[PDB]
Amino acid sequence: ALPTPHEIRNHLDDYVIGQEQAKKVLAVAVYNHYKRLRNGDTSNGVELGKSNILLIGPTGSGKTLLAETLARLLDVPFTMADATTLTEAGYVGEDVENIIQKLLQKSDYDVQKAQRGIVYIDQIDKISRKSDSITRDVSGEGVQQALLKLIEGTVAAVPPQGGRKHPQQEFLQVDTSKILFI
Amino acid sequence: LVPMVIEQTSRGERSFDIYSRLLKERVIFLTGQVEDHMANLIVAQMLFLEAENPEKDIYLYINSPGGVITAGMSIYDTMQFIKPDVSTICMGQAASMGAFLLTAGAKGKRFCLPNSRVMIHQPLGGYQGQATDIEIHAREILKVKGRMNELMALHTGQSLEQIERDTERDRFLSAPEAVEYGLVDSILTHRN
Numbered sequence: 001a002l003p004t005p006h007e008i009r010n011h012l013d014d015y016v017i018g019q020e021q022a023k024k025v026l027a028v029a030v031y032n033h034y035k036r037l038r039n040g041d042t043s044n045g046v047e048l049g050k051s052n053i054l055l056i057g058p059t060g061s062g063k064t065l066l067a068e069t070l071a072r073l074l075d076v077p078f079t080m081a082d083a084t085t086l087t088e089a090g091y092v093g094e095d096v097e098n099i100i101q102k103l104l105q106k107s108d109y110d111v112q113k114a115q116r117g118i119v120y121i122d123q124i125d126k127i128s129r130k131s132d133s134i135t136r137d138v139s140g141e142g143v144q145q146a147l148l149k150l151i152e153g154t155v156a157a158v159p160p161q162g163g164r165k166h167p168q169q170e171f172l173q174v175d176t177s178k179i180l181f182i
Numbered sequence: 183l184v185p186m187v188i189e190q191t192s193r194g195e196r197s198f199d200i201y202s203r204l205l206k207e208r209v210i211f212l213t214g215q216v217e218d219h220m221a222n223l224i225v226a227q228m229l230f231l232e233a234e235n236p237e238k239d240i241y242l243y244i245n246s247p248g249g250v251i252t253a254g255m256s257i258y259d260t261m262q263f264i265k266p267d268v269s270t271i272c273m274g275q276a277a278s279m280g281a282f283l284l285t286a287g288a289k290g291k292r293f294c295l296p297n298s299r300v301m302i303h304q305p306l307g308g309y310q311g312q313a314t315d316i317e318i319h320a321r322e323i324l325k326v327k328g329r330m331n332e333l334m335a336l337h338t339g340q341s342l343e344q345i346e347r348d349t350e351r352d353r354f355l356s357a358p359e360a361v362e363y364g365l366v367d368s369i370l371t372h373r374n
């Protein structure tokens with residue numbers, strides 16, 4: 001017996017005040033996530049799509065709070081990364097694989113269990129283009145282009161346990177079509 | 183005061199004066215009396231457009247009561263030297279020198295507005311001094327009068343004898359008469 005949207009909403013009421021519309025979105029979205037997982041395109045419903053979430057609000061309202069408190073009652077693996085520490089491929093800053101890597105630390109390197117997890121991103125506006133093109137932006141628009149394929153679904157390469165050193169030269173392939181992003 | 187406009191481009195937004203925006207499109211304005219400063223400014227504009235593109239037509243709008251002769255002849259020689267066809271349009275009025283630059287435009291690309299007016303007369307001058315000096319300045323202005331009539335006939339197609347009789351005194355020519363006179367090619371009544 002999985003939790004209902006009303007049950008999970010009451011759980012969040014004990015940690016959030018003055019947010020009705022936002023609770024309904026995460027409750028309905030997380031609920032549908034379990035159903036999409038329960039039927040891995042094996043039932044009559046084939047090719048079950050995905051629907052991510054985009055939270056918008058002022059600072060200090062509880063956006064970071066919802067991501068942490070939600071992981072308590074969910075019990076599936078959850079992580080939290082920062083969009084600020086990202087750049088286009090070929091630059092030292094770019095660590096786009098780290099987000100998937102982090103998820104495995106929480107799941108104890110369980111690929112079958114990491115695909116069924118949830119991920120959250122904070123400070124997404126930091127990479128909005130400034131419409132300045134006559135130059136190349138390592139940070140900003142450039143970063144968004146790399147995330148396109150990651151959300152839709154693909155198989156990123158992850159260094160095992162973050163990579164021991166260069167001699168191994170092997171990577172971990174983990175499907176991402178089923179992973180949710182908030 | 184000159185109004186400022188914004189030219190939307192892929193690189194970004196740029197602010198331009200109304201006169202500078204039209205200059206980018208091969209358009210030059212000839213306003214007021216023709217003097218050494220105003221004439222020397224238009225010459226630099228024509229040369230700038232020649233280097234940017236030598237195959238695109240230039241448009242010259244003239245609204246002027248005339249002025250110095252020497253200042254105007256610098257523009258005429260420039261229009262003939264450069265390869266691009268300098269299209270001329272008459273707005274409001276075209277005096278003696280304004281008319282000479284009007285007819286000096288490229289053949290087939292000369293227009294006159296339906297209510298425009300052209301006026302032509304002989305060169306004006308004067309001198310004060312010894313009789314020997316008056317004879318010199320008289321011979322010089324006579325050469326200019328003869329020279330200005332020869333070029334007028336070349337572009338208008340009329341005979342030199344006809345230009346001499348018509349330029350003895352002030353002669354106003356309406357827009358329809360200018361076409362019949364060979365001064366212009368057609369009239370831009372409406373946009374088709």
Ligand SMILES: Nc1ncnc2c1ncn2[C@@H]1O[C@H](COP(=O)(O)OP(=O)(O)OP(O)(O)=S)[C@@H](O)[C@H]1O
Binds near residue numbers: 017060061063
């Ligand atoms: N809806 C809310 N209800 C109750 N308390 C809230 C709410 N939103 C924010 N708070 C309080 O504000 C604190 C900080 O909220 P945050 O989750 O950091 O907001 P934030 O938008 O995520 O800030 P960032 O991550 O720097 S953009 C929380 O620990 C709560 O005490």
